[PDB]
Amino acid sequence: MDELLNRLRQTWHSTIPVSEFMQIAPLSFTDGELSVSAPLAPNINLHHTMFAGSIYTIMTLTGWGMVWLQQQLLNVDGDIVLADAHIRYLAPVTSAPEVKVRWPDTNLSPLQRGRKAKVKLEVQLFCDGKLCAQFDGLYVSVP
């Protein structure tokens, strides 16, 4: 999984300048759960807590990353697009968070038939073990 996550990070930074500036990078992928993080420094706001835009962006890329990983596991490829998302900010983020996402009870099999595959992902952001933000996004994979 090391090589896999390393490739994901490289893909983000090379294609999305903002992800490189925010220093977003995968932490781990185990037992079907993807974990991602980023330092607070470039992502700060007035109160030196994590900026709302950075919070959203890291969660968006965490969902994106999960779809990418599931595509790899299925040996298929497709454009990953976020159709819509809902985000709730529960508490300020005071340090580098742990952003996690688990794969729901679905699959991307349609991609194997040359058909688009949609998935609703729940992404959660934790800081010091507490949930500080909730994200729900609809990702579509287009072959």
Next chain:
Amino acid sequence: HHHHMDELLNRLRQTWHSTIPVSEFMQIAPLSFTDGELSVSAPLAPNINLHHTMFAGSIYTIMTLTGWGMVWLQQQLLNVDGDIVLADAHIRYLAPVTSAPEVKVRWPDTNLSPLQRGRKAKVKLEVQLFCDGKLCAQFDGLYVSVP
């Protein structure tokens, strides 16, 4: 900078770049503020994705800063102090953004008197993003300001 409220708009831009490093990297800046409508934009370059269109995260960020900026502006006009925080938001991506967009928000005449009472105030704003005159993204955010 001169816009089509210059003092406030420059103040807003300076507040963003000096307190939020991401906003400076994204080169987000106000365009105009008249008749209750705030217009904001950002270049595509630092905000691209693999398709060379605007990155979903940048789209969201510019829209949330535009909403935040509107609340900030209204507070400045009343000379009231309050920490503005986005509580929840919903965003829909309709079409790819191929150039510097026009992000707009219109003030719904929200009562901010509670802030002048020492009470938190809730502000629901709608932000729209256009490119070449076409609506490409829709944003709904609930902001909470605490005195």
